[PDB]
Amino acid sequence: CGEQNMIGMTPTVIAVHYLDQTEQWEKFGLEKRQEALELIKKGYTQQLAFKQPISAYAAFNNRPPSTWLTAYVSRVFSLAANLIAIDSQVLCGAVKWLILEKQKPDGVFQEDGPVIHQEMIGGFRNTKEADVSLTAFVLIALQEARDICEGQVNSLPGSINKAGEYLEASYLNLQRPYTVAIAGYALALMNKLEEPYLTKFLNTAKDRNRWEEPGQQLYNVEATSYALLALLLLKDFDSVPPVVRWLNDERYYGGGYGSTQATFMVFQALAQYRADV
Amino acid sequence: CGEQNMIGMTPTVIAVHYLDQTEQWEKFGLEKRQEALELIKKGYTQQLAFKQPISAYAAFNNRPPSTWLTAYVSRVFSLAANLIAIDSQVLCGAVKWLILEKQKPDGVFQEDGPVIHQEMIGGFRNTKEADVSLTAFVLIALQEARDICEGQVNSLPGSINKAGEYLEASYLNLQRPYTVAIAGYALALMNKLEEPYLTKFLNTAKDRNRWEEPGQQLYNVEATSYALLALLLLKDFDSVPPVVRWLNDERYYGGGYGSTQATFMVFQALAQYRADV
């Protein structure tokens, strides 16, 4: 089904990205990379079977589309476009649908068809501050789709800016570390993570190494990974080592029930850290 | 298919085991355990669809059975029998088939139907010393099946001892750290890891923290995890901390292409370490 395929695909996509960006295939085995790529190609192809005529996705072709899932497909495909051949008409069709059907005038993205596999959406599963969680998530996916799709979808910069302005308007009153972290990264992507929003972002971390909610280990890995990406964009390299250390000590249970966002984000964030430093 | 289902199942089975044995659900979220169990039940049920009338397994019901895969199903089901209800007639039927069809008079187990997914078998994929790799692997699976199956299959102790005597006969001449590690654990399970075999086992490790082959990160996590289980059986607690530290620093890429044995074994070994110490 169209959700599980993305669950299945995620760890290998982001493992190949990480090994590539950190240049760590000698220890891993460079002869292993091509078989990993073949698995990513199979995942891509299988996912196309769940693309609806609208270019959006759901678990089944008969199920009404998920905003979240469509944006996750955009997130994964955008990154995977550097590993395997991906049809921009498929990727950018999903982008177009997100903006033209699911974004409200205030910039918020709405989910009309929640995913079945609620464990694959990370901290968004806690519905507190959900309009921020989802709008930040979709904004980041759209930002990641810009390289390929900004030319094909000229509604894309305006949609990003509107989502970003919503997040700015919402940021100082957020109570969740998860939301301060993911929206923090969304704001940093548009160079809006400045005072007074920056104090809010930094003050929310504990022991200057994590953005933590109680009893939510995998949400916290995911949140802290978004925070790390923001600190890197800020070029705040003084603040990075404790965050990297904490992340490397965490169990994230890749391939395990509920680990999809934690897996994607920890490896994305740790790869960027080596790239940058 | 019957291989991929086991690939899919593995991380959650061993995550639940690990969280249980180390009593770490408060930080993880105890409300998450029942949904994980439902996924394990679905994996079990789906695997039964690939049980052939012989009680052995292959990727497809039309494919001749794999010795390796059947033994892996025995390994996973034996451990999972403590988490979900498993039909002993299914588990012990597989045990019986392994012993009555695939074990030679010298104690070695033979693979007549290699798995398609060669990435899921860990260091056995390197075919050097393969009769030891496979015989140790199957011996360990059979040992793990004893709680449930020794009463149902009274050929089981003799089969274990014969495999163990083969490993003893083969041990001092092994050249691979992988094989010294997995066969080391097999020998320790039968209290045969004594001199001169013990010197061989210990001398093969590097920096008293790992059993390493070049360019094979995931084989090395798997091997070192088997080594850790052996050191624990030896009650050699002086030798354990460096091995635990090294394992906790490794990337094992759970859910990623080629990670199945590394995922099962690292969490099995780290759970036993907390149990024991």
Per residue, the 3-state secondary structure of A94-136, as one string, reads HHHHHHHHHECCCCCECCCCCCCCHHHHHHHHCCCCHHHHHHH
- Least Cα separation, residue B129 to chain A (angstroms): 20
Is B215 an interface residue toward A (CB < 8 Å)? Answer: yes
- In the numeric block, the tokens 């260091």 are attached to B123
Which parts of B146-216 fold into alpha helices (H)? 146-149, 156-171, 177-189, 197-204
* Number of neighbours of residue B175 by Cβ within 10 angstroms: 10
User: Which residue in B3, B66, B5, B92 sits closest to B41, CA to CA?
Assistant: B5
C-alpha span between A246 and A249 (Å, rounded): 5
Is B23 an interface residue toward A (CB < 8 Å)? Answer: no
Write out residues 103-122 of B within 8 Å (CB-CB) of A. 119
| Residue in chain A nearest B266 by alpha carbon | A253
- CATH number for position B6: 1.50.10.20
Provide the number of CB pairs (under 8 Å) joining chain A to chain B: 89
Residue pair B16/B36 in contact (Cβ under 8 Å)? The answer is yes
Instruction: Name residue A193's amino acid.
Output: L
Phi then psi for A90, rounded to 5 degrees?
A: -70, -55
Please give the method by which this entry was determined.
X-ray
C-alpha span between B9 and B73 (Å, rounded): 11
C-alpha span between B43 and A121 (Å, rounded): 21
Mutate to test the interface with A, among B14, B17, B257 (most CBs of A within 10 A): B257
Measure Cα distances from B64 to A263, B54, B91 in Å: 36, 11, 19
Is A15 an interface residue toward B (CB < 8 Å)? Answer: yes
Interruptions in chain B after residues (C–N over 2.5 Å): none
Is B11 an interface residue toward A (CB < 8 Å)? Answer: yes
Beta-carbon contacts of residue A73 (< 8 Å; ≥ 6 apart): A6, A47, A57, A94
User: Which residue in A14, A248, A267, A240 sits closest to B250, CA to CA?
Assistant: A248
Q: How many structural domains compose chain B?
A: 1
C-alpha span between A218 and A66 (Å, rounded): 22
Paired strand residues for B103: B109
User: Which residue in B127, B129, B130, B135 sits closest to B109, CA to CA?
Assistant: B135
Residue pair B10/B252 in contact (Cβ under 8 Å)? The answer is no
| Residue in chain A nearest B220 by alpha carbon | A28
Q: Identify the DSSP state of A31.
A: G
Is A255 an interface residue toward B (CB < 8 Å)? Answer: yes
Mutate to test the interface with B, among A19, A25, A245, A253 (most CBs of B within 10 A): A253
Q: Which domain holds residue A66?
A: 2-277
Q: Inspect the interface and report whether the beta carbons of A27 and B248 lie closer than 8 Å.
A: no
Q: Which two tokens stand for residue A268?
A: 């994305």
* Number of neighbours of residue B54 by Cβ within 10 angstroms: 14
Q: Cα-Cα-Cα-Cα dihedral of B141, B142, B144, B145, to 10°?
A: 120
Chain A neighbors of B26, CB-CB under 8 A: 215
C-alpha span between A201 and A50 (Å, rounded): 38
| Residue in chain B nearest A247 by alpha carbon | B249
Is B224 an interface residue toward A (CB < 8 Å)? Answer: no
CB-closest option in B8, B11, B217 to A29: B217
Q: Inspect the interface and report whether the beta carbons of B253 and A11 lie closer than 8 Å.
A: yes
- Least Cα separation, residue B239 to chain A (angstroms): 22
